[PDB]
Each structure stands twice: as structure tokens, then as C-alpha cells.
Amino acid sequence: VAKLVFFCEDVGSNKGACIGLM
Amino acid sequence: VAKLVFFCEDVGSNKGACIGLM
Amino acid sequence: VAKLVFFCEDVGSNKGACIGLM
Amino acid sequence: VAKLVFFCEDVGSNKGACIGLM
Amino acid sequence: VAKLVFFCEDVGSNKGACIGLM
Amino acid sequence: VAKLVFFCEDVGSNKGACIGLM
Amino acid sequence: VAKLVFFCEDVGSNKGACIGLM
Amino acid sequence: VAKLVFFCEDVGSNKGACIGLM
């Protein structure tokens, strides 16, 4: 985003994970 | 969250809109 | 824009990074 | 996001549409 | 304002705080 | 942070650029 | 900003202080 | 702020005047 920033989910407990994107 | 972390939700078409949290 | 609105740009991998602006 | 908040694109060469999100 | 433009307000002590407007 | 909070960086000329984040 | 929102930065060599602004 | 972004004063001496900052 430059630094690396996590993008995390919270979709009905489908996921609570994240991914690094610049 | 400290550091910036993006939290995403469904918007349709398997796309995510993500806001930042500290 | 007043009121807060999120303005997003694609960071890849189906995710959009959005910040609040007025 | 609660309250209805608008999300818009300024990605680049694809002008800005928006949608409301909670 | 489209484009990002910062609007600033003096908080004294040689500094002003500025928010984004579209 | 929830609630919007402005996070500000110095950008010179005794001005802080401030972004909303949760 | 109306309504009271906190504005924060990172003071000194490192500690985060905020103030209320409208 | 990258690109040049205008920082405009809201009240006081130089209201309506802006400077470019990064």
C-alpha cells in the first residue's frame, strides 16, 4: 500500500485471515 | 490496531472494500 | 465531501484500500 | 459500517461510481 | 473537491491540523 | 480505532496531514 | 470537525498524544 | 503527501489561500 499492509476478513466466520498487500 | 490494518467486506463480484483500522 | 465518504483504489487480489475523506 | 456510508472508486482511468455500505 | 485537497485549522504552537476533502 | 480517529503526520510548513482511521 | 473527533500523532521521540477538535 | 497536494486555510489570515506540500 509504500509499505506492506494486511487485509483481513470477517465474513460470517467464513474467514478471519489476512493477506499482505503493498 | 499500534499499526494500520485493513478490514474488508463483500461488495459483490467477489470484490472487497477495505477500511483501515489502527 | 459535509459528510465522510470512502475513496478506494484497487490494491490487487480483489481488494480495495479505502480511506475516509470529506 | 452502524451507519450507511458511501464507497467510491478513484482507481485510475475508470471514473468513480459508488455504493452504500453499512 | 475530483481531487484531494487538505483544509487546515491552526492549533497553535506553530502547527495546524488538516483534513482531506474531495 | 469503533470510532473514527484522525492520525496526523507532519508534512512541513507546520502542517499535519490527517487521515481518518477506525 | 459538527462533532468532536480526536486527532493523534506521535510526539517527542515516541509517544502518541491526541487532542479533541471539532 | 506520492504527489503534490494543496493545503488550504479555512479561517484567519490566509483563508482561501493554499500551499503545495508533498
UniProtKB/Swiss-Prot annotation, chains A, B, C, D, E, F, G, H:
<feature type="binding site">
    <location>
        <position position="1"/>
    </location>
    <ligand>
        <name>Zn(2+) 2</name>
    </ligand>
</feature>
<feature type="site" description="Cleavage; by alpha-secretase">
    <location>
        <begin position="3"/>
        <end position="4"/>
    </location>
</feature>
<protein>
    <recommendedName>
        <fullName>P3(40)</fullName>
    </recommendedName>
</protein>
<feature type="site" description="Cleavage; by theta-secretase">
    <location>
        <begin position="6"/>
        <end position="7"/>
    </location>
</feature>
<feature type="site" description="Implicated in free radical propagation">
    <location>
        <position position="20"/>
    </location>
</feature>
<feature type="site" description="Susceptible to oxidation">
    <location>
        <position position="22"/>
    </location>
</feature>
<feature type="binding site">
    <location>
        <position position="1"/>
    </location>
    <ligand>
        <name>Cu(2+) 2</name>
    </ligand>
</feature>
